[PDB]
Amino acid sequence: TCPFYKKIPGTGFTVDAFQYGVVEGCTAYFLTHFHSDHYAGLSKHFTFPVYCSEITGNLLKNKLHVQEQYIHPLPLDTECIVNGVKVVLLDANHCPGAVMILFYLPNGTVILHTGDFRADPSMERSLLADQKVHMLYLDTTYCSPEYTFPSQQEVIRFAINTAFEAVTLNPHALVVCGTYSIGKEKVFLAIADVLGSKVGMSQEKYKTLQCLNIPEINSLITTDMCSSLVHLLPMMQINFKGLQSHLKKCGGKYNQILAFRPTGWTHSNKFTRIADVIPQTKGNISIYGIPYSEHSSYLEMKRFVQWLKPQKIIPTVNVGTWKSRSTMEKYFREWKLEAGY
Ligand code: NI
Numbered sequence: 001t002c003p004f005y006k007k008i009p010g011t012g013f014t015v016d017a018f019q020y021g022v023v024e025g026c027t028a029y030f031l032t033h034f035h036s037d038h039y040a041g042l043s044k045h046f047t048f049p050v051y052c053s054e055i056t057g058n059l060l061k062n063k064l065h066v067q068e069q070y071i072h073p074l075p076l077d078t079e080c081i082v083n084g085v086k087v088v089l090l091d092a093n094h095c096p097g098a099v100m101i102l103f104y105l106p107n108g109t110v111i112l113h114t115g116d117f118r119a120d121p122s123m124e125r126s127l128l129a130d131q132k133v134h135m136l137y138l139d140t141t142y143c144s145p146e147y148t149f150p151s152q153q154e155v156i157r158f159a160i161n162t163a164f165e166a167v168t169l170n171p172h173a174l175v176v177c178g179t180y181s182i183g184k185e186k187v188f189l190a191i192a193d194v195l196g197s198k199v200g201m202s203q204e205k206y207k208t209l210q211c212l213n214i215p216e217i218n219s220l221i222t223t224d225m226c227s228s229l230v231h232l233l234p235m236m237q238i239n240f241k242g243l244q245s246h247l248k249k250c251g252g253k254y255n256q257i258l259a260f261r262p263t264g265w266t267h268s269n270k271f272t273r274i275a276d277v278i279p280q281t282k283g284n285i286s287i288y289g290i291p292y293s294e295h296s297s298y299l300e301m302k303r304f305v306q307w308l309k310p311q312k313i314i315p316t317v318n319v320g321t322w323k324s325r326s327t328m329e330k331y332f333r334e335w336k337l338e339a340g341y
Contacts, residue, residue, distance in 0.1 A: 001020060002014060002017050002020045002023045002026075003319075005137065005314050005315070005316055005319065006316075008103055008111060008113070009105070009109075009111075009135075010105050010106065010107060010109070011028075011083070011085055011103065011105070012025045012026050012027035012028065012083070013026070013027070013028050013029075013030060013082075013083075013085070013103070014026045014028075014029055014030065015030045015031075015032060015101065015113050015115075015137070016030070016031060016032055016038040016039075016115075017029065018031075018039060018040060018041035018042045018046070019040045019041035020041070021041075022048075026048070027049070027083055028049050028051055028072075028082055028083055029048055029049065029050050029051070030050075030051045030052065030101060030113075031050055031051070031052045031056055031060070032052075032056075032092065032098060032099055032100075032101070032113070032115030032116065033053075033056060033092065033094055033095055033097055033098035033099065033115055033116060034055075034056050034059040034060070034063075034095070034097060034098075034181075034182055035095065035116065035181055035182070035183075036181065038115075038116070039060075039064070042060070042064055042066060043064060043065070043066070044064065044065040044066060044067065046066055046070060047067075047070060048070065049070055049072055050066065050070055050071055050072060051072045051074060051082055051087075052071070052072070052073060052074070052097075052099070053073060053074065053076065053089060053097045053098075053099050054073040054074075054075070054097070054213065055096050055097025055211065055212055055213055056073070056097040056098075056099075057071045057073035058097075058211035058212070058213075059097070059182075059208070059211050062207065062211055063207070063208065063211070074087075074089050075089070076089050076090065076091060076099070077089075077090065077091075077126075077127065084106075085103065085104070085105070085106070086103075086104040087101060087102060087103055087104070088101070088102040088127055089101055089102075090102065090123070090126055090127065090128070092114065092115045092116060092117040092118075093117060093118040093119070093120050093122075093123070093294075094115065094116045094117055094118060094183065094294045094295070095116075095181070095182045095183030095184075095294055096182055096183070096185065096212040096213075096214075097182075097212070098115055098116060098117070099115055100112060100113060100114045100115055100117060101113045101115070102127065102128070102133075109134050109135065110131055110132060110133050110134055110135075111133070111134065111135045111136075111137070112128065112133045112135070112136050112137070112308070112310075113137040113316075114136070114137060114138055114139045114316075115139065116139050116141070116294070116295065117139050117295070117296060118293065118294050118295055118296050118300065119296040119300040119301050119303065119304035120300070121303070123304065124304075124307055128308070133308055133309075133310055134310065134311045134312070135310060135311065135312050135313075135314065136305070136308065136310040136312070136313050136314065137314045137315075137316050138301075138305070138313055138314065138315055138316060139295065139296065139301075139316060139317055140301075140315040140316065140317045140318055140319075140328055141295045141296070141317045141318070142265065142293075142295055142296060142297055142298055142301065143298065143301060143315075143317075143318070143328050143331060144298060144327070144331075145298045146269075146270065146298070147265050147269070147297055147298050148269055148270075148297055148298065148299065149265060149269055149291045149293045149297050150273075150274045150291065152186065152292060152293075154274050155187075155274060155290050155291065155292045156186060156187070156190050156292075158274050158275070158277065158290065159187060159190065159191055159260060159288075159290060160190055160191060160194045162258070162288065163175050163191045163194060163195060163258065164194050164195065166256075166258045166286075167195055167229065167258075170255075170256050172253075172254055172255045172256065173229075173254060173255070173256040173257065173258055174229055174230075174231060174247070174250065174254035174256070174257050174258070175191055175195070175229060175230045175231070175257075175258050175259075175260075176230075176231050176232075176233055176238070176243065176246070176257055176258070176259040176260070177191065177199075177230065177231075177232055177233075177259070177260050177262070178232075178233060178234065178235040178236075178237070178238035178259065178260065178261045178262065179205070179232050179233070179234070179235060179262075180234060180235045180236075182208060182212070183294050184262045184292050184294065185209070185212075185214070187260065187262050187290075187292055188230060188232060189220060191230055191260075192220065192228075192230045193220075195229055195230060197228050197229045197230050198219075198220055198221055198222045198227070198228045198230075199220060199221045199222070199228060199230050199231070199232060200221075200222055200223070200224065200225040200226075200227070200228035200230065200231045200232070201221065201222075201223065201225075201231065201232040202223070202232075203223055205232055206221060206222075206223050209221055225250070226250075226253070229254075231246075233246065235261065238259050238261045238287065239287070240282045240283075240285055240287075243257050243259055243285045243287070244285065247284075247285075255284060256284045256285070257284070257285045257286070258279075258286050258288070259285070259286070259287045259288065260287075260288050260290055261287060261288070261289050261290070262290055262291075262292040263289055263290070263291055263292075264291065264293055264295065265291060265293065266289065266291070268289075269291060274290075274291075277289070277290070302331075302335055305332075305335055306335055306338070306339040309339065309341040311341075313332050315328055
């Protein structure tokens with residue numbers, strides 16, 4: 001059954017709760033973003049109302065084949081009414097179309113559900129600043145002080161300079177970027193822009209990108225692999241074997257690969273700066289690991305919550321074991337004692 005952390009009190013709403021069949025009482029199912037864990041269970045066979053951003057609606061329509069009658073897209077930053085209740089969707093700074101949802105309950109309680117998010121100080125000057133939030137449903141993916149990472153802009157700058165150097169040294173080098181869902185598009189779009197190239201990719205991936213309301217998209221991406229010097233492949237192919245195999249397929253148009261694996265955190269965040277990063281190399285193939293995160297670091301999450309000063313926190317990630325919940329509660333109490341709420 002649907003856990004209490006996916007239910008919004010004193011409404012019949014749920015959030016990211018599609019894997020439990022019919023939820024008893026639920027009149028509206030909200031979807032924060034188009035990542036498989038959150039949408040798990042949605043298909044062309046679903047027959048209840050789904051509320052979401054315009055981008056998430058495009059993806060539901062085109063990728064999952066959910067029938068149009070059940071998709072209720074809402075604009076961002078706009079007060080809307082859903083089944084008698086005031087809501088606002090806000091940019092989550094996660095992947096394309098990802099939202100936080102603000103729910104203004106009839107009794108006067110205000111609830112923020114973050115979805116998946118990367119907390120940022122620009123969120124301190126949104127509609128959130130206008131009133132007290134009593135309850136926060138929080139993306140606790142990286143809720144532990146070991147999780148640090150550079151800014152997105154630091155990582156992109158590094159990727160750009162690296163790629164530009166490599167292809168100026170060898171104009172027959174190919175650049176490959178690994179990918180598995182939506183998100184982290186800036187990695188490949190920024191590398192292509194410095195090289196004066198479009199991004200080549202499979203038909204299914206191109207179809208996905210064509211849903212995302214990216215300006216001038218047709219000038220940036222193609223299904224003609226031949227004509228482009230940045231290619232997208234599945235993350236699983238980003239290794240020496242998969243990459244040599246791909247190089248054989250391109251028909252001697254390239255003689256070297258430089259590949260990037262955008263990852264979350266891995267243990268080498270605890271010593272290395274982005275400027276110290278060096279690739280793994282075998283022959284004419286080099287693979288760079290780059291920690292491009294679309295989740296809050298510990299410090300970013302701590303700052304947002306200490307600013308917001310919620311009266312109660314409901315974790316939505318790592319809630320499956322008592323040890324994780326206990327550990328998280330410890331950090332929430334520390335933050336509250338430091339900040340005086
Ligand atoms: Ni996500």
